[PDB]
């Protein structure tokens, strides 16, 4: 039931963010939610190209690095790479088919485009510090260590995409497919989207900020500056992305866009709380692999874990959830000079 | 049966362009087909922002235009806006789920992204020349003459998107759904893909160039110069887009990438020919509507129809189809001043 161009003339200012009539005309002179247009404008003003950044000295720095420090750096790089690979394609495949207002549709495509730039920035870095990228990229797919901290991400997406297909093909109701009953409920599909968005918010607001900490730690000891410039640029974009998800979630919760959503959100309550708790726990567990062969002066499992708790409470509070960790001060205040 | 991150370790250099294992890692250090990486790089170096273009004198230019010329300029602008709205979302929703090589996946997202900048530019022009933009945007969806093309284009995308869902959900074979038999054939799905591709090739290779001629006809008279600067940037991007689909089609029909597709394209060869000739005929009928109230300096239904046949012959030959019209030279060589 999906269409690339709905022939019905509708007031786009009256459609909900999701599940309404598919967007037909792309206009930007007006918007139901001005914030998405502001995010497109900001992101476009930040346009950058990784190839231009000078990472020529990073090879000398990396080579001089002690083995366990090479391990920490390259492992952080492999994870960032896997997350961006998924973020480059997923927002378009999972959200585009469900969006019903123009500014949000375009923001999703701009956001996803920026992710492919990040992925491209990692190839730029890898190529300039290793003799063969092929070894780095192949290890990403294998090595359960990586897949372990990331387990569940592709899960939330894949499930949303499949239920969305059944909905477009069969419509709401109970059906018979090859002799088996299949139920299609819009209420359950709306729940699937909210949970997905929450997982994405956790990915960009928490999982990525933990990785930045590891990157900037090297920058503090005046090493890997080429990588550092790029990470600052990526972090500047990520702040825009997390703002977008925070607004999507809070607007859906308010009930002003779709009352049924506010009702479902109250039911999603414990589930979204738990997925944030699970993500936080996965980041900590990943620390065990990062510091397998040893840690660094100002960075170790303990400090990283404190930062995970510190940032998770901040992110969860921003979307109205209760805080799972003890309140604390920033454990690595030096990172502030690198962000913003 | 689609996944945002396939857990199987595969050689991305040995996968077909389409219908293979879904892309897992996003890397840009190598590629099966260099053309797509080349295209991503060129498109990125061309980055521009419509806001930067001064269109402050276009308002007075438009008001002073005779009645029939306003009709021409605005009808053309609305058709362009229509196609751009479709091209900004469709390649993503229709192709991403079927691609199996990383360079092609990112090119498609980069391509789609560039189209949303084109949509943004038309909003920039429209509100700088009409006072009440809503009137323009609403006519785009309901205009009977314009829609005499919207459904045909949308139909090719929609049918491919629907069959793709059945294939991903049920797989090949004879199934039953709510008392009805439903057959799923990969061979038929392959044919559907070859068709959106031929259709989109005709769209960017022919439909858009016919509209460029009209825009630059005004620029040759020193009118609507802000509009002209923007169409020049747009046309520069389109040359890259059509290069992309031309390569996809030739790789699929030669048999180099997928023997089966080559066998399929050979059997539906007459259908592909009729499809291209049908697109040229619609552009001819349009020129008719465009000049129903009179012509202007440098353009008329006859000169325009001659350009359609000239450009159509060139594009069809590029993808292996016989020429439908008589060969001739370029009817309007002055257009090269604004193109390539
Ligand atoms: Fe990113
Ligand atoms: Fe992001
Ligand atoms: Fe375009
Ligand atoms: Fe295009
Ligand atoms: Hg999501
Ligand atoms: Hg998700
Ligand atoms: Hg860290
Ligand atoms: Hg198509
Ligand atoms: Hg025209
Ligand atoms: Hg024309
Ligand atoms: Hg064909």
UniProtKB/Swiss-Prot annotation, chains A, B:
Choose one Gene Ontology CC annotation of this protein and give it: cytoplasm
GO biological process assignments? 2'-deoxyribonucleotide biosynthetic process; deoxyribonucleotide biosynthetic process; nucleobase-containing small molecule interconversion; ribonucleoside diphosphate metabolic process
Query: What organism is listed for this UniProt entry?
Result: Escherichia coli (strain K12)
The GO molecular function terms of this record are: identical protein binding; iron ion binding; ribonucleoside-diphosphate reductase activity, thioredoxin disulfide as acceptor
EC numbers for this chain: 1.17.4.1
Top EC class of this enzyme? oxidoreductase
Outline the inducing conditions. Induced 4.2-fold by hydroxyurea (at protein level).
Which keywords describe this protein according to UniProt? Deoxyribonucleotide synthesis, Iron, Metal-binding, Oxidoreductase
- Protein name, entry field: Ribonucleoside-diphosphate reductase 1 subunit beta
Q: How is its activity regulated?
A: Inhibited by hydroxyurea, leads to dNTP depletion, replication fork arrest and genomic instability.
Q: Where does Fe cation 2 bind?
A: 115, 204, 238, 241
């Amino acid at each position: 039931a999906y269409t690339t161009f709905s022939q019905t003339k509708n007031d786009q200012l009256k459609e909900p963010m999701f599940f309404g009539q598919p967007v037909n005309v792309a206009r930007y002179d007006q918007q139901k939610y001005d914030i998405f247009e502001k995010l497109i404008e900001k992101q476009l003003s930040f346009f950058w190209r990784p190839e231009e950044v000078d990472v020529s000295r990073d090879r000398i720095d990396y080579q001089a690095l002690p083995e366990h420090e090479k391990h920490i750096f390259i492992s952080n790089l492999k994870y960032q790479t896997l997350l961006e690979s998924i973020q480059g394609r997923s927002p378009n495949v999972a959200l585009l088919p469900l969006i019903s207002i123009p500014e949000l549709e375009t923001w999703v495509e701009t956001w996803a485009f920026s992710e492919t730039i990040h992925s491209r920035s990692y190839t730029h870095i890898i190529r300039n510090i290793v003799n063969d990228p092929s070894v780095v990229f192949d290890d990403i797919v294998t090595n359960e260590q990586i897949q372990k901290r990331a387990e569940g991400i592709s899960s939330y997406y894949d499930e949303l995409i499949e239920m969305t297909s059944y909905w477009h093909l069969l419509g709401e109701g109970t059906h018979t497919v090859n002799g088996k009953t299949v139920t299609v409920s819009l209420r359950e599909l709306k729940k699937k989207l909210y949970l997905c968005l929450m997982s994405v918010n956790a990915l960009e607001a928490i999982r990525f900020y933990v990785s930045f900490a590891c990157s900037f730690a090297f920058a503090e000891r005046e090493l890997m500056e080429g990588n550092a410039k790029i990470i600052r640029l990526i972090a500047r974009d990520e702040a825009l992305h997390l703002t977008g998800t925070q607004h999507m979630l809070n607007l859906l919760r308010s009930g002003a866009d779709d009352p049924e959503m506010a009702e479902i959100a109250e039911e999603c309550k414990q589930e979204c709380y738990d997925l944030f708790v699970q993500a936080a726990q996965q980041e900590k567990d990943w620390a065990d692999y990062l510091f397998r062969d040893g840690s660094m002066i100002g960075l170790n499992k303990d400090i990283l874990c404190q930062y995970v708790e510190y940032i998770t409470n901040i992110r969860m509070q921003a979307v109205g959830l209760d805080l799972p960790f003890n309140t604390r001060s920033n454990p690595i205040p030096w990172i502030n000079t690198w962000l913003v």
